[PDB]
Design a binder for this molecule. Structure first.
Ligand SMILES: CCCCC/C=C\C/C=C\CCCCCCCC(=O)O
Ligand SMILES: *[C@@H]1O[C@H](CO)[C@@H](O)[C@H](O)[C@H]1NC(C)=O
Ligand SMILES: *[C@@H]1O[C@H](CO)[C@@H](O)[C@H](O)[C@H]1NC(C)=O
Ligand SMILES: *[C@@H]1O[C@H](CO)[C@@H](O)[C@H](O)[C@H]1NC(C)=O
Ligand SMILES: *[C@@H]1O[C@H](CO)[C@@H](O)[C@H](O)[C@H]1NC(C)=O
Lengths: 50, 50
């Protein structure tokens, strides 16, 4: 909350407000770089080049 | 996918991922120009000047 800010943050399967009350089993992080118009394509049930 | 890119693309009545498996009956295309803040108004159940 002091340094880093996100333009988009969207969660699926769980309300965000409960993220501090849970514990997570098999955590993986995927990283890549896209353009601004392709960020909407990173979602379930989407079409496009990405 | 080589030349043209869209800032918004939203479909109603069908998942986008099935658009290649179907065939369409009465296809019409409407064209116009708006400002950036009015693009959110082109949707069902919306209010505003547009
Ligand atoms: C110009 C005539 C088009 C007629 C097609 C009629 C029905 C087909 C339905 C949808 C086609 C979507 C075309 C654009 C897809 C953009 C994909 C993307 O990059 O996000
Ligand atoms: C937040 O960042 C500022 C500037 O770098 C720093 O002075 C401050 O100590 C930070 N706060 C915490 C709690 O680390
Ligand atoms: C990221 O790392 C670089 C170098 O390690 C540092 O200069 C920068 O301040 C860091 N940014 C944040 C938000 O911590
Ligand atoms: C994509 O565009 C580039 C640049 O115009 C062109 O050289 C290339 O042949 C195009 N690809 C296809 C499959 O048409
Ligand atoms: C659109 O048409 C113009 C002229 O016909 C052409 O110069 C331009 O490259 C075309 N754009 C695309 C994305 O095909």
């Amino acid at each position: 909350y002091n340094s880093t800010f996100f333009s988009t943050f969207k969660c699926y399967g769980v309300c965000a407000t409960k993220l501090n009350d849970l514990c997570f089993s098999n955590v993986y992080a995927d990283s890549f770089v896209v353009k601004g118009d392709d960020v909407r394509q990173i979602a379930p049930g989407q079409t496009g080049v990405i």
